[PDB]
Write a protein that binds this DNA or RNA. Sequence first.
RNA 1: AGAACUGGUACGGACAAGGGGAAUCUGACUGUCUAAUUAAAACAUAGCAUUGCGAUGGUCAGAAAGUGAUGUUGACGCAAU
RNA 2: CUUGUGACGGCCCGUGAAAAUCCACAGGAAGGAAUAGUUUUCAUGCCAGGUCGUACUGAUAACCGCAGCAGGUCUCCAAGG
RNA 3: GAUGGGGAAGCUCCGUUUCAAAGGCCUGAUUUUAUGCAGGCCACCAUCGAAAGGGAAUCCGGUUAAGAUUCCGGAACCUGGAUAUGGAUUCUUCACGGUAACGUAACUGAAUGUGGAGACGUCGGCGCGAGCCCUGGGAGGAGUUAUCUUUUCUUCUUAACA
Lengths: 77, 96, 251, 91, 135, 112
Amino acid sequence: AREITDIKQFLELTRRADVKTATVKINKKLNKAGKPFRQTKFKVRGSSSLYTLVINDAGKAKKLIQSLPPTLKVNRL
Amino acid sequence: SINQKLALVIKSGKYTLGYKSTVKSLRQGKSKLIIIAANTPVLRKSELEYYAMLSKTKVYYFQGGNNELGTAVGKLFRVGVVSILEAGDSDILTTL
Amino acid sequence: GRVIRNQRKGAGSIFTSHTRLRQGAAKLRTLDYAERHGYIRGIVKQIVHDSGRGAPLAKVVFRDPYKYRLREEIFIANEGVHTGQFIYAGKKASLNVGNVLPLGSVPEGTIVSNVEEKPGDRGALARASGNYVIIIGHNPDENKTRVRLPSGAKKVISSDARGVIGVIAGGGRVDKPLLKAGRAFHKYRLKRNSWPKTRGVAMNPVDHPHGGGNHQHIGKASTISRGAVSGQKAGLIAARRTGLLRGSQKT
Amino acid sequence: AKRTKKVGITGKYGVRYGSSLRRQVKKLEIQQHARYDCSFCGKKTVKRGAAGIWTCSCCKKTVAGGAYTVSTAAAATVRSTIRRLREMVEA
Amino acid sequence: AKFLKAGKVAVVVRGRYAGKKVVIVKPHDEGSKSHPFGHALVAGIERYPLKVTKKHGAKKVAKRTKIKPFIKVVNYNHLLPTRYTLDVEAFKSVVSTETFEQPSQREEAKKVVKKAFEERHQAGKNQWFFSKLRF
Amino acid sequence: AQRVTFRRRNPYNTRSNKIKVVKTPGGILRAQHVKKLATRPKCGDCGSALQGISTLRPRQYATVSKTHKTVSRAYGGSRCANCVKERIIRAFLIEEQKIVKKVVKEQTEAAK
RNA sequence: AGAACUGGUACGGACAAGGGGAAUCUGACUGUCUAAUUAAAACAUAGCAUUGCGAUGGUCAGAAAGUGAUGUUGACGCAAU
RNA sequence: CUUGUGACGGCCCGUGAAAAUCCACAGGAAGGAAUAGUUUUCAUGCCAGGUCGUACUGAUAACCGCAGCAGGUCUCCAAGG
RNA sequence: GAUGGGGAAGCUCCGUUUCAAAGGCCUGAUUUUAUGCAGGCCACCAUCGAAAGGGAAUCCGGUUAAGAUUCCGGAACCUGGAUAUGGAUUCUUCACGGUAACGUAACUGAAUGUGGAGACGUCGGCGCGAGCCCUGGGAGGAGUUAUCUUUUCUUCUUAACA
Ligand SMILES: [Mg+2]
Ligand SMILES: [Mg+2]
Ligand SMILES: [Mg+2]
Ligand SMILES: [Mg+2]
Ligand SMILES: [Mg+2]
Ligand SMILES: [Mg+2]
Ligand SMILES: [Mg+2]
Ligand SMILES: [Mg+2]
Ligand SMILES: [Mg+2]
Ligand SMILES: [Mg+2]
Ligand SMILES: [Mg+2]
Ligand SMILES: [Mg+2]
Ligand SMILES: [Mg+2]
Ligand SMILES: [Mg+2]
Ligand SMILES: [Mg+2]
Ligand SMILES: [Mg+2]
Ligand SMILES: [Mg+2]
Ligand SMILES: [Mg+2]
Ligand SMILES: [Mg+2]
Ligand SMILES: [Mg+2]
Ligand SMILES: [Mg+2]
Ligand SMILES: [Mg+2]
Ligand SMILES: [Mg+2]
Ligand SMILES: [Mg+2]
Ligand SMILES: [Mg+2]
Ligand SMILES: [Mg+2]
Ligand SMILES: [Mg+2]
Ligand SMILES: [Mg+2]
Ligand SMILES: [Mg+2]
Ligand SMILES: [Zn+2]
Ligand SMILES: [Zn+2]
């Protein structure tokens, strides 16, 4: 329900010692009339709120998922 | 009366109308004399002579309200206070 | 016969006054050490219309001399009193409109209102809109004062009784005709249930002394002696005279 | 244009209540709705809130006055009379 | 004659320090590029010293005599000049137009005026200036 | 043209029962109750709606931080800015007048 | 708003939707009542007039009270006609 | 069209509730640091939130009129021509 | 509508702050120990009375033979309480910036006092919002098609909270 726009803030937020799960959503969006791009969302289920990070770059999306801690339960959908 | 002296100030000397202008003039030391209407807010009145006391400026109180003072200086609106920057050709500064 | 209407008011079932919207009992400040030895100062905050009362109220704020509080009083506004005006109450107060000088320390011919009949009862006399009291003269020894009431009757009261200087605001209220039962309806809607009034002559004889008959007529004399008992006092009670007033009242 | 001849403000009461009664209310109602000088701010911004309550829209000042006018004749005599005694007793 | 001089004491009537005594250190009648209006460089006190009695001994007095000063640019329209005065010599140099526009030298400018303020208040100097304006 | 109904057990169009018809992600029209509108805080002196202060129902004021309920000036969340200015002006002048009255009073008595 | 043209003179085409005038009696008006035979010319009303009362009071209530209504009231008020 | 709201204007001899509850300010009692404190009106972090009603009709059949009575019974939403 | 009181033979009546000796509030000491002494503080002085007045906090989707703002899934908020970390501030101890209206992530504050909110009529017109109605383009489905009709009907939605 709250937005995070800082990747550094997001990555440390995954180490809050309370979050147990997270999900990754893939969307097909149109930047303009011609080009369809792939949208990815990073949602972390905090104890008190849900934090969503949105990435419009496929390259940055991949670099992030390898950087997620292994102990975190990630859901792909 | 006294308004006839004021009328000559308007046609000859220079002056200011309104509370904000006169205190600015009084602050810079360019004011020689101020005139206060009878119905002026007494708090606004009170700070004026204190300002005048700091600047060593003569003070005179008009025997009339806002409307009478405004008509005294030949203006269609009401004036609560006027300041005399220069007599020009009048005689109010020496008298009263 | 049936209990007539004027008896039935005493029980106070539905005949009590409607007091929801009133802002409070309009009484003078209590008589304490400060007022009977000096004077105290007050500030007029609100000038409020009182429901069921023609005159407006004056809401003056005082300082408690003994504790750090801000005792707030409710006065009856005199004509000429404005918000933010300083109000002086006490024996040594200056004679100005709205002041509460005791009747002993005020010269003759002065106008006062909301006058106390006894010192310390916080105002009894001349409390209606447009009403006032004349001070005729004093009696220095056995301090005691003679005043004129709105009724035209001369009353002599103690010199230490207080009374506010001026005339009660809202005068001339009764000059305008109402023109409408609704205006009367709304007027009495906030005072008490005493309207409309039904003529006794238009009543059954069981309901009123005047009732009954093949023609609407009182029958007996309508001047009722003061010695009559409840249920007979229906009409002109203890009427010294009657009929149209031609000539001076000779009071 | 001139909408009415004599009734003036009392045209809202129509053809009823009687001419004389309509005449008296007209005289009082005009004073009721009129605008008066502000004794403090010197403006045509004094109106009646309720019976006897007259307030200045500017300067936010309220003064107690007549039920239908800012001040009646009796108070004017009283205020002078009070002032007559005041300078009589101080000197 | 103009009275807003480099030693007068005034009262701020508007702003965060409303009702605080200030002493004019550097006047500017004909405004400036940064402030196109008659302004000054007053120095004032934010936390006035507390009352001190005989009972407090040697540490409550020290605690109760703390002074929090401040320096600000203020329009003349937001000041009431007083008939009182308080000379400014030990801290008229530090208070200047370039003392502002970066925080670095602001604090030790406040540090100097803090020393001067308490030093005068330590002696029996200018009681009215150090007395809190009650309203 | 769906017609909505009250979501609670009060069928009377009272002040506490005001509704606002809204459209849900389900595609249907469902009424929702709206709370009574907040009233701006007012000045104690000038009687006007003093600004810079969040306007909520009284109980919610216990939730928000101190910043929303005050201004950084003396009489922050209580009096109007101009109201503060005039009372500061009023204070200094009258207190100064007290010295003026006092020196006059002791002067005139010393003469006699 | 206007103009041509057109029809078995039809056209607010169904629906919807004031009869009017000349006078007399009586109540000024809006309003209220005899639920279940009488809605009126009766009642009320604004206006007018009269009477009582300055509170240790007037009118009225209770068996009594250290009891009550008017009265959070004060003659431009309250009470009775 | 319905409804909410803002700024206004008109009306009064009518000016059109109270309390619980929450907050702010004034005030400066008290407590406070430097080898360490102060702070839970900033963020995050933990736990708990009892008791009672919750079905349906609400009317030419679920209510009262002896009844499955053409009577009576408060209210919300209201498409097109 | 009790109590203190006052009537009445009595069932009970009057009265709700009144001719009353009408109490708890918080801090600290004592760590034989539980709480009396240390204090200070304050003056209404029972209670009941509204499922339409005031009032802390929830929405969406789905599910049953019959329940749902209550159940399931997801996402929030309030009150009360224990707290640990981060942040903030301090050697000028209890923050800074802006001329100003004022701004921020915070940014001591007891007794006492003041203010605000709660908290408010009705009518008329005007502006603005939401929902509904109307309608175009397009993307799907259905109807009529002896003849005509880029046609007729229908779906295209986004809650609380941040
Ligand atoms: Mg009646
Ligand atoms: Mg009969
Ligand atoms: Mg009989
Ligand atoms: Mg008879
Ligand atoms: Mg409710
Ligand atoms: Mg703010
Ligand atoms: Mg804000
Ligand atoms: Mg019948
Ligand atoms: Mg009939
Ligand atoms: Mg009749
Ligand atoms: Mg009586
Ligand atoms: Mg409606
Ligand atoms: Mg209005
Ligand atoms: Mg249910
Ligand atoms: Mg149900
Ligand atoms: Mg149902
Ligand atoms: Mg139904
Ligand atoms: Mg139904
Ligand atoms: Mg039945
Ligand atoms: Mg009882
Ligand atoms: Mg209860
Ligand atoms: Mg309730
Ligand atoms: Mg209400
Ligand atoms: Mg909600
Ligand atoms: Mg159901
Ligand atoms: Mg759930
Ligand atoms: Mg900061
Ligand atoms: Mg309020
Ligand atoms: Mg959205
Ligand atoms: Zn004014
Ligand atoms: Zn203000």
